[PDB]
Write a protein that binds this ligand. Structure first.
Ligand code: HEM
Ligand code: HEM
Lengths: 176, 175
């Protein structure tokens, strides 16, 4: 089931609270090179999709087995399997580096278990999750995390603190 | 007409020998990837620059002008538009985000190439050949145009002239 890493800095924050603040920090991103983001290995598919903010040093990384349709029907659909979302700050590496990595990784969500097929187009969950983050709207990631936590134990939710989810077996603290 | 910039390092080199050496250095089925697409500035598929790093070494180049790339549209996988410059060297930095590509060490820059190729010509256009050739480290299409451009200025000048010699002529300038 879902597993979570967090920086001690965020020990007392609720996930809903952390994800709202992370997204306002990242902001909203005409599409061009500064703005498309990147796939590993790419160009339009890979095990990792990563995007830097145009506004701040915030950065994120979506991992699993992902496919972007670009202009093919249904256009501008991200689909595939999404296993991880890693949020933080200052993106590094890429296709010729062997993977994207965050220099300062604040929080990660792993074993999401999300899978959307091409046929749902842009209404697919994987699409609505990653596109949300690109756009400064983590609400779709929030909604999805909330369901994973609830199925583990009906007491846990995006309004649990990270530390409470550590007590629950789900989260695991790291330095800062 | 054509103008060259070169690092005093290559003052003694012929244009042909330097392009032979850069190509050897850049290097030579291979699945198309983030590691060999290069990129456009602003991009993603159009800009005032295209640039690529070799996967084998630090070698890299920047094609400058007003460039368009068809990708999957027709004619498929065609670079067209205007190509004014090719810069060759080491250590590609920058991007759309940094407001431009650059080379931390630019060795040679060929400018005022006056190359202009329409969409219709597809992959048979001179812009496409020059640049695709360079995407695999092959400077022969580039070399061919630079030679014809050197000569139009004066027949005594050519790809076999040293950069020093193209300076003395008035075509080249030391960086
Ligand atoms: C990573 C490589 C990507 C590239 C090169 C790319 C490129 C583009 C470009 C060039 C456009 C402009 C469309 C237009 O103005 O006609 C666009 C729009 C769009 N992209 Fe991407 N994108 C990438 C990744 C993603 C991802 C991962 C998602 C979703 C998670 C996405 C979703 C969209 C959506 C929804 C649009 C809106 C199209 C519209 O205006 O209706 N893109 N993309
Ligand atoms: C943003 C940069 C580029 C991207 C993302 C890109 C993407 C691709 C991809 C994915 C393919 C493979 C088609 C396939 O096998 O499924 C391809 C092929 C090709 N590209 Fe590019 N390309 C780029 C730049 C260029 C440039 C600048 C040129 C010309 C100077 C070019 C010329 C070609 C040619 C001739 C092929 C066909 C090779 C073959 O089918 O064997 N590409 N491109």
């Amino acid at each position: 089931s879902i597993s979570i890493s967090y920086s001690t800095t965020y020990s007392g924050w609720t996930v809903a609270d952390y994800l709202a603040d992370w997204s306002a920090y990242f902001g909203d991103v005409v599409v061009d090179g500064s703005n498309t983001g990147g796939f590993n290995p790419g160009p339009f598919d890979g095990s990792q999709y990563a995007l830097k903010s145009t506004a701040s040093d915030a950065a994120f990384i979506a991992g699993g087995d992902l496919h972007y349709t670009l202009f093919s029907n249904p256009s501008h659909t991200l689909w595939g399997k999404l296993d991880s979302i890693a949020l933080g700050d200052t993106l590094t590496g890429g296709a010729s580096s062997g993977g994207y990595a965050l220099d300062s990784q604040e929080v990660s969500f792993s074993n999401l278990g999300l899978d959307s097929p091409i046929a749902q187009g842009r209404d697919g969950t994987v699409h609505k999750v990653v596109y949300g983050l690109m756009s400064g709207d983590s609400s779709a990631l929030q909604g999805q995390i909330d369901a994973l936590l609830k199925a583990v134990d009906p007491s846990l939710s995006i309004n649990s603190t990270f530390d409470q989810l550590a007590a629950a077996g789900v989260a695991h603290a790291t330095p800062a």
